[PDB]
Amino acid sequence: EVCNDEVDLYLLMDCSGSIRRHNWVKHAVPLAMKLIQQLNLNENAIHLYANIFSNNAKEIIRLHSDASKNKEKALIIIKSLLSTNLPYGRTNLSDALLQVRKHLNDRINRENANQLVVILTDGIPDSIQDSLKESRKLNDRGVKIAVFGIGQGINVAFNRFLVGCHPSDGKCNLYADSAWENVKNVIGPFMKAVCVEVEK
Ligand SMILES: [Cl-]
């Protein structure tokens, strides 16, 4: 796997109504699955956390659970997202980020592990200010943030600002974007680049 290190990885999966059910089924859920496939989930390597967010954040994989540390068990849970009322609602990225900060506050995370947030999103947050504020508070706790943008509703400048890059210029290893139909071709190289940054 291109991601293989002691990393607590918080997958924040946008489930907003802007996605459209057919994209959710054919692309978003398969994208999360392929993302997970880039990770060595193990007690001594990556531990996964996952939430979905639209109106609010909802945890779907508990950090350090069996599914957090085993890829087959993680993939069953992601696949279970198909048989739901998703997608729907707005884009409450700040509440999704807040849940990660609650893990840190509460000392749930491995203190020894690098802390990485990976956001999958097709839009702009409800509150750019609340999002960038949470993100700062995460950054102060040593958290790195990566963003994978999808489709025409994103704002690339905001995404790049979020991950700590210049909004337009220069290489940004913590950011990538893709058209809906192309996401599974962009995810592997993105996760390779992100994991290289996290390690360096
Ligand atoms: Cl928000």
Side-chain angles (χ1 to χ4, degrees), residues 1-71 73-78 80-101 103-128 130-132 134-135 137-170 172-198:
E1 292 96 352
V2 300
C3 292
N4 174 43
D5 206 337
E6 185 176 355
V7 182
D8 290 335
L9 192 165
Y10 308 81
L11 178 58
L12 275 37
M13 190 178 182
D14 183 339
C15 62
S16 58
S18 69
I19 290 167
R20 301 300 173 90
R21 173 74 178 176
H22 61 86
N23 283 331
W24 182 250
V25 167
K26 299 308 279 187
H27 303 296
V29 159
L31 176 61
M33 295 182 88
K34 186 155 183 189
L35 181 157
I36 291 166
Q37 292 174 331
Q38 312 312 299
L39 306 179
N40 180 23
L41 301 187
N42 188 271
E43 188 70 61
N44 273 319
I46 311 303
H47 296 200
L48 181 65
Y49 162 90
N51 74 36
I52 55 171
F53 71 92
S54 65
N55 294 344
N56 294 290
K58 168 166 162 174
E59 177 181 291
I60 65 162
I61 298 174
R62 176 175 67 86
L63 191 60
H64 309 139
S65 71
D66 288 353
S68 181
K69 292 173 296 203
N70 180 269
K71 293 168 85 178
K73 285 153 196 202
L75 297 164
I76 293 179
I77 298 174
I78 298 303
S80 83
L81 292 175
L82 297 171
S83 323
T84 62
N85 68 342
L86 302 170
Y88 75 85
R90 52 180 162 72
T91 315
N92 194 350
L93 174 64
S94 61
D95 189 54
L97 295 166
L98 177 54
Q99 305 317 309
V100 173
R101 197 169 53 97
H103 283 74
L104 314 176
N105 189 80
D106 287 0
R107 209 165 311 270
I108 304 312
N109 66 296
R110 294 173 294 167
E111 277 178 326
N112 202 56
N114 286 316
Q115 305 291 308
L116 172 62
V117 162
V118 180
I119 298 154
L120 309 180
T121 191
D122 83 318
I124 296 158
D126 295 337
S127 171
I128 299 279
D130 285 5
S131 291
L132 286 166
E134 282 299 327
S135 71
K137 298 183 168 173
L138 295 172
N139 285 158
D140 287 343
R141 284 170 171 271
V143 176
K144 295 204 185 158
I145 308 174
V147 175
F148 186 89
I150 307 172
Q152 301 306 135
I154 57 178
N155 187 259
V156 349
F158 167 79
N159 291 343
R160 290 172 64 101
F161 279 136
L162 192 62
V163 305
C165 290
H166 190 280
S168 63
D169 303 342
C172 183
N173 290 322
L174 292 171
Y175 182 62
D177 58 39
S178 183
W180 274 108
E181 69 271 16
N182 206 214
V183 293
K184 273 175 74 193
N185 300 129
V186 183
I187 190 62
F190 169 71
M191 290 308 289
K192 184 186 170 87
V194 165
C195 285
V196 166
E197 295 299 311
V198 172

